[PDB]
Design a protein around this ligand. Structure first.
Ligand SMILES: [Cl-]
Ligand SMILES: [Cl-]
Length: 118
C-alpha cells in the first residue's frame, strides 16, 4: 500500500507546506501546492475538490488526489506486481509509466534520502 511515510517524503521533495496556496510554472507547466500537482494529474486522480486550483493548492485535498492516483496507477505501472514507495514516487514524478522510466530514478533517490534522514 501507499503509506503516509511515502507520501510525506514525496511532499518534502516537492516543497510541502511552503507551497500551500501557491502555483507556479517554473518547472515547465502549471504545478500547484505541496505536491506540485499538474492539471492532467488532477484529472487522472478523479478531479477531487472544488476545481484544479482549489484542490491542489490545499494540502488535504492534494493528499486525497495523490492517494487516489497511487491506488489507480501503481499496479498499472508495475504490470501487476505489488508496488513499493519507489514505484509510487516515480509515478508521482513521471506519470503512469514513471516507475519504468530512467528519468525518474533521480527523483526516487531524493525521496529515498528523505526516508533515510539524509
Ligand atoms: Cl520502497
Ligand atoms: Cl534518464
Amino acid at each position: 500500500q501507499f503509506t503516509d511515510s511515502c507520501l510525506r517524503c514525496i511532499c518534502k521533495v516537492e516543497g510541502c507546506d511552503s507551497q500551500i496556496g501557491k502555483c507556479g510554472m517554473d518547472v515547465g507547466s502549471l504545478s500547484c501546492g505541496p505536491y506540485q500537482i499538474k492539471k492532467p494529474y488532477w484529472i487522472d486522480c478523479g478531479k477531487p475538490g472544488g476545481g484544479y486550483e482549489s484542490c491542489t493548492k490545499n494540502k488535504a485535498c492534494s493528499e486525497t488526489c495523490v492517494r487516489a492516483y497511487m491506488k489507480r496507477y501503481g499496479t498499472f505501472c508495475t504490470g501487476g506486481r505489488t508496488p513499493t514507495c519507489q514505484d509510487y514516487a516515480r509515478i508521482h514524478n513521471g506519470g503512469p509509466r514513471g516507475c519504468k522510466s530512467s528519468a525518474t530514478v533521480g527523483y526516487w533517490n531524493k525521496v529515498q534520502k528523505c526516508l533515510r534522514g539524509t
